[PDB]
Structure formats: C-alpha cells, structure tokens
Amino acid sequence: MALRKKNSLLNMANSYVLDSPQPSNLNYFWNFGSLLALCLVIQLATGITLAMHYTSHASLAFDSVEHIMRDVNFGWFIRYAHANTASFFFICIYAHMGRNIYYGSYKTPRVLPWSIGVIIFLLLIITAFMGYVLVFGQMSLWGATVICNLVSAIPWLGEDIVHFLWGGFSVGNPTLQRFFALHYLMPFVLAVFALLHLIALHTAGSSNPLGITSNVDKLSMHPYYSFKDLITVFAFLLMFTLFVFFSPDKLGHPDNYIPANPMVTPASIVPEWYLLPFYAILRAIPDKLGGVIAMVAAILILLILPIVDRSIIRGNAFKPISKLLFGFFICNFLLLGVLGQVHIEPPFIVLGQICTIFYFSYFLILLPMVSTIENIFFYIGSL
C-alpha cells in the first residue's frame, strides 16, 4: 500500500487534496473555494506581517500605519495587499455563495456545509469590520461608532453592552486595542470553520453543475483540479496586481487617510463596500431594533434555503423560471449595495424599502412558489 494512503497524517492530506474524488464536470465557478483559500492565506501572511509593524495604541495607530507605508521595506505593498485582498475576499465569497445558491449546493445532503458556511460569512464580516477600525482614520472611528451603537438597540441591556464592547464611554484606545487582538484572532477561528465546512462536505462530495450524482464518474482532485485552479489563481493575481500596484486606493475611502477626530463628523458615514447591502437593509426599517434584526435576518435567512426550496431537482441549470428569479435576486442584491452608499434622500428612501422587501420575499415567498410550480411543469411537461 502506497505511503500516502498508509500513513494517517499523509492520508488526511491525500483525502483532501490529491485522491479526493471530484465530479469530472466542475465549471469555473467551482474555483472560488480555492481562491478564498488563497485570499485567506494572503491575509494571514500580510496580516501577521503588518502586525509586526502596527501599534495598537490609539495615540500611535494611525501613525504606525503611515510608518508602514513610508518606512518599512515594501510596507506599502504589504499594506495595500492586505487592504485590497480584503475586498477580493468578499468578491470571492459572494461568488462562492452565489454559486452555491444557483446550483442548489445548500440542498440535502449538503445542508451542513452550507450552514457552517453561513457562520463563516458572519465571521468574515466581523473580521473585516474590526480590521477596518485598526487604521483609526476618520472612517475607522465613525464606522466603529455607528456600528457599535446598533447594539444599543438590544432592550434593557443594550447601553451596558455597548460600553462593555468599547471598554469606555466612546470609541477610543480600549476599543482599538481590543479590536487589534480580536482581529488577529478571528481569522484563525474563520480558518477552523472553513476547514469544518470542508470536512462536512466530504461526506457527500462536491455538487456539480448538472445537479445529478457524480458517483458514476469521478476524477482525482489532482492533477485535474490542481491545474484548473492555477488558471484562476493567475487570473486573480492579475486582478490583484492591477489594484495593488496601479490603483491601490480605488476601493478605499479617502476619509480614512485623515486621522480619527471625534469632533469632526465625516460627510457621509458608510461601511466598506462589501457591507453596503446589509446597511441598506438596516436603513429600510424605521425602527432602530427592527433595523438591526432585519440586518441580521438578511444573513441568517440563508439558513432556511434548504427548507424553502421545494424543488425535486437540485440547482438552476435546468430551471428557466428559477434562473430568471435568481437573476433578479442577484441584481436586487447589487441595487441594495448601491443604495447603501447614497444619501438618505428621496427617492432612494422608498426604493431602498422596496428592494428590501424584494430581498426577503425571494426566500419567503417567491422561491417556495416558483420551485413548487416548476416541479409541476417538469412532471406535466414530460408526460
């Protein structure tokens, strides 16, 4: 028996990266998993490196980031790499979740990897929010202020919890130092959950774009998906290069290059672009607590996809109506993103509410209805 199968440690690696049996028809949207792993590795390497030069004290934090930009050899690269990869991490995670929703990766027997995935998504959001605060520019401070004040909505204890998070009566030094520590930690927690969702998936194997079993026709993970993953790695690195080297601040907010000033409030306080859809959902609800619940529910509602999708068929490749509905859902999610960064003005107020209603009605009404109807059309249609 070959060593890679005999030795227990090697065999675990073997089972995931080499002999792992994959469907032979995975398309390029199955490559986001590995890109996300690459982002996670880049973030660990660049993040740990920035941590060697960054100072968490509020009196020095912003200046330590300037020191990294200006004094540390290749500091500019490591800083921009870390900051831009945070954006690419969310592009890839949305793409990965999009793939999973379109191809019904959330259906049995893959509910568990899907559900763990929803938690990974929450941890990524928390990680990226805390990391943003560490710069301690104007957006860092004001974003932390506004987002941490949402916890004030929790009844009875809310105020007390906010003061507890801050370690203080406003966002300041204690908050910054604690976010540094947690921002360092959270990516390792995220890596553990990412590994768990893979282990959960390994019982069923990957889904495939046809939504049928692949048990009939498997291909080793290496060399076929190894070399297919290289193509997107190099395509990703090209996109990474164009941002990091040629336009490092295209995805950034200029206000974050002004040191935090609790007196001056910036013109518009918006989150980083990848949180904007959730921010639009929050604004849609007039009630403070309502808004917060809706915002959390917009993420947690993904957990009900396994239930509300009533289709007898896995995924959308063969379902014209579901594909149209999915197209509208995705474009609405992008509109929410856009409305997250406009000013609270007519007519965007009403529009934001309509998009929020469309967002929720996809899970609660349209997907259950459309999936039921298509079941019937397939049966009657093929008689």
Binding site: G211, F377, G381
Partner: protein
C-alpha cells in the same frame, strides 16, 4: 418536496379541463426551454437521489433501466465538461422521455408515508 406531492398535484391539474387547457401547453414549453433533453437526459434522471427513499427506488430499478440510466448520466457529464450539446440520437426525443423512475419512487414513498401514518394511530 415529495414526488408523491408533485404527482398528486399534477393529477388535480390534469383532471380540471380549464386548468389542463392552460397548464399543459405552458409545461410543454417550459420543458423545451429547460433544455435537459439537449444533454440526453430523461426528466427523471434529474430528480435528487441523495435521500434514503430515492436510494431505495433506484435499487428497485430493473437492471436494464439501471444500466441505461448510468450511461445517460455519464454521457451527460461528458457533454457538460466539454461544453457541447447532444446531437442526433443522443438528444432525448419527447417519446423517449418516459417516467421510468416515478412508479418506483411512488411505491417507496407510499410505504414510508403509510408507516408515518400508522406510527400515529390511536385505537378508538
């Protein structure tokens, strides 16, 4: 959803003259646009099989039907990875799109649903 549910609902529609007059033509166009026939699948090939019920139904297929199903799945997988469509004899014609599996899954489910009912019986 259960295949039983889908089949019962479809039968309610096919009964109602009005309903069938408007639904049957829609469903036929839906199936044409669905495009599974272009990969040489029959409709029933697409039903989710990773449940205990469906595994049981597949085990009950006659060997011939079972071997042919495996071929259609392999062939379709190959078309998928090649980004080609079926041509000629590989395209499923409407007359070949037979519900070979529906009888088996309906029997499996009938027993499973009777089992659930009878597990809840109360002597009167």
């Amino acid at each position: 959803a259960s295949i039983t549910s889908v089949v019962k609902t479809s039968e309610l529609i096919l009964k109602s003259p009005l309903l069938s007059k408007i639904v049957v033509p829609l469903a036929k166009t839906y199936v044409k646009f669905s495009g599974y026939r272009q990969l040489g699948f029959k409709m029933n090939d697409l039903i989710i099989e990773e449940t205990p019920n469906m595994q049981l139904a597949l085990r009950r297929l006659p060997p011939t039907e079972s071997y042919d199903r495996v071929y259609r799945l392999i062939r379709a997988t190959q078309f998928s990875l090649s980004h080609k469509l079926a041509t000629g004899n590989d395209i499923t014609k409407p007359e070949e799109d037979d519900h070979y599996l529906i009888p088996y899954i309906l029997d499996v489910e009938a027993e499973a649903f009777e089992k659930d009912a009878l597990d809840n019986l109360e002597v009167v």
